[PDB]
């Protein structure tokens, strides 16, 4: 219940403030512990194409980390096709019960812009990205182009 | 006047001092019973390390108080 009281005010603040990186804050007003949102990057090749994210706030919030689920597919070395990201700001070893979810949002977006070929869950893809960066700026470009969304 | 210096394990030392007696002289007076050259010895009082060149009366010490003694195996 305290989760709901915190989330309603956080969501109201985010909506009132307005951001240049987060659109379409979709949320079920009844459950209110699940968020669906659309992010847009700027750096190539992920800039061409929009794509969506789903957040699942667990029951014991803000005293447990909110797990994030990455719904739409994307060609990123640090993202699984099932849509799982690591994002150390959320892992249970560092979650501090005062961080606003928008800080998680900027952390995730910075992850999107800047890859981490040294902490991969697609080993061969990351090795190749760290090998011949030039071509993947096009290889992921086609994948996002045919699998992104309208920005 | 009679003061004392305590080692880390817990052994007790009695030393008499004169007002003008210097820290290095006190280190020697320790060594004549402890066999530790003054480079290794350090003297501790009021949390602040006792400066090498100073005098025992500079810190306004009165007898009876313990000037806790600590070892240091580097000692420069």
């Amino acid at each position: 219940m305290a989760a709901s009281r915190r989330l309603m005010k956080e969501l109201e603040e985010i909506r009132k403030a307005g951001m240049k990186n987060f659109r379409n804050i979709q949320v079920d007003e009844a459950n209110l512990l699940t968020w669906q949102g659309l992010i847009v990057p700027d750096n190539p090749p992920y800039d061409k194409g929009a794509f969506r994210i789903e957040i699942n706030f667990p029951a014991e919030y803000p005293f447990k980390p909110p797990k994030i689920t990455f719904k739409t597919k994307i060609y990123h070395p640090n993202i699984d096709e099932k849509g799982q990201v690591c994002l150390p700001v959320i892992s249970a070893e560092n979650w501090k019960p005062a961080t606003k979810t928008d800080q998680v949002i900027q952390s995730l977006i910075a992850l999107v812009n800047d890859p981490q070929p040294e902490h991969p869950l697609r080993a061969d893809l990351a090795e190749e990205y760290s090998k011949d960066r030039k071509k993947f700026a096009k290889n992921a470009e086609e994948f996002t182009k045919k699998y992104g969304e309208k920005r | 006047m009679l003061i004392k210096v305590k080692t880390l394990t817990g052994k007790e030392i009695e030393i008499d001092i004169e007002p003008t007696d210097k820290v290095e002289r006190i280190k020697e007076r320790v060594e004549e019973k402890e066999g530790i050259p003054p480079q290794q010895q350090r003297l501790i009082y009021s949390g602040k390390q006792m400066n090498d060149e100073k005098t025992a009366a500079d810190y306004k010490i009165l007898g009876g108080s313990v000037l806790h003694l600590v070892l240091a195996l580097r000692g420069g």
């Binding site: - | 394990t9 066999g35 530790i36 290794q40 195996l73 580097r74």
Partner: protein
């Protein structure tokens, strides 16, 4: 009726010896006699009244063990090894040759009783040590009551504890037997060698059996040399390879002192013979001059000189000096007393922070010379701590290892003993 008897008999015997108190702690006779009396009385009690059932004898034996091993005499001298020592001392003081002649029957009976008191004690190794020591003494000094008695005691000890328990004593006894045999053969071989002026006799022991140490750095006088060399050459003849390490510290002879006025006949130890034979030529030697010729150690020379000076044969420059306590210096005269007189003849002139210091020195010398060898380090730390104390080499090695595991040094890679400075 069993558990109760054990509690009564243990409690009764304990206070029986408490009464003597310290008087027993220096007189084994009363102690052993008291234990024997208590045991005899309650053995007689459970011998007839209780028909000698197993349980009651078990109670008697358990309680006797209990109150023999720990009791007042044990506690007062504060150990459990004061009862076997007292028993050994009683056995020795019984088998010695005193003025009284021991009757064979009563001797055998009393040894039989000592065997009982022995079989109750619980530490039968301390008893062997003490009995071996005393038997060695009274065999060497020819001071014994009856060889049949000695043989019987060893035999019953062997019966009660097995062949391995009493092997040293059996060898220690057969050695005196072989010595007695060999002396006769030396006398026979001596008919053709004409021994210079003396009656000679030797007792040749073994090495591992007897509890004796090597020697005390003695220089033989020329008076005995002919006999010494002749016997050693005779001994080397009858055996293949064997090395006699003579020990003069416990050996005795007889002087004749045909230089005074009334023809006395002294009787003293070999150290006395060395010193008094020294004064054959002159009478103005000092302690240094004596040690120049006899090579005896300072402390033993001082003891012997004091014991002689107690007698009126040798006198300091002072005449009334309390020679019992006045200690003398290397530049002190000794005068032969020419007028000595005894009321009779045949005189008998005889009687941690330290570890922290170790570590401090280790690190000091380490930072002085980073690389250096183990043995040289041992020498240098010994020099640095000479004015304080000489720690044992195992202790120094231990402290070295503790400092290694405390990360102030590490032995260099590839060598067992070479220490480099931890940075």
């Amino acid at each position: 009726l069993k558990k109760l008897l054990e509690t009564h008999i243990h409690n009764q015997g304990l206070a029986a010896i408490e009464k003597c108190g310290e008087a027993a702690l220096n007189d084994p006779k009363m102690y052993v006699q008291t234990v024997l009396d208590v045991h005899k009385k309650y053995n007689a009690l459970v011998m007839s009244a209780f028909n000698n059932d197993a349980g009651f004898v078990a109670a008697l034996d358990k309680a006797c063990g209990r109150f023999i091993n720990n009791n007042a005499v044990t506690k007062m001298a504060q150990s459990s090894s004061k009862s076997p020592e007292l028993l050994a001392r009683y056995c020795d003081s019984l088998l010695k040759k005193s003025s009284k002649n021991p009757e064979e029957a009563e001797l055998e009976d009393t040894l039989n009783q000592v065997m009982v008191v022995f079989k109750y004690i619980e530490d039968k190794d301390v008893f062997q040590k003490f009995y071996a020591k005393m038997l060695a003494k009274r065999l060497v000094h020819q001071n014994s009551a009856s060889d049949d008695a000695e043989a019987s005691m060893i035999s019953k000890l062997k019966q009660a504890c097995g062949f391995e328990y009493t092997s040293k004593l059996q060898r220690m006894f057969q050695d005196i037997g072989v010595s007695k045999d060999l002396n006769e053969q030396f006398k026979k071989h001596l008919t053709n060698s004409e021994p210079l002026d003396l009656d000679f006799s030797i007792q040749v022991l073994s090495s591992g059996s007897w509890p004796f140490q090597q020697s005390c750095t003695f220089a033989l006088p020329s008076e005995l040399e002919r006999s010494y060399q002749r016997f050693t050459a005779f001994y080397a003849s009858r055996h293949s390879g064997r090395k006699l390490t003579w020990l003069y510290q416990l050996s005795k002879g007889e002087l004749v002192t045909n230089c005074f006025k009334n023809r006395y006949t002294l009787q003293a130890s070999t150290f006395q013979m060395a010193i008094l034979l020294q004064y054959n030529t002159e009478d103005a030697y000092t302690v240094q001059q004596l040690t120049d010729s006899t090579q005896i150690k300072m402390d033993i020379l001082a003891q012997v000189l004091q014991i002689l000076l107690k007698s009126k044969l040798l006198v300091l420059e002072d005449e009334n000096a309390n020679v019992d306590e006045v200690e003398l210096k290397p530049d002190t005269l000794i005068k032969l007393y020419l007028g000595y007189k005894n009321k009779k003849l045949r005189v008998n002139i005889n009687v941690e922070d330290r570890k922290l210091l170790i570590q401090a020195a280790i690190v000091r010398i380490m930072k002085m010379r980073k690389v250096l060898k183990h043995q040289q380090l041992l020498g240098e730390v010994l020099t640095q701590l000479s004015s304080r104390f000489k720690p044992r080499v195992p202790v120094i090695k231990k402290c070295i290892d503790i400092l290694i595991e405390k990360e102030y040094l590490e032995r260099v890679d590839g060598e067992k003993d070479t220490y480099s400075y931890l940075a």
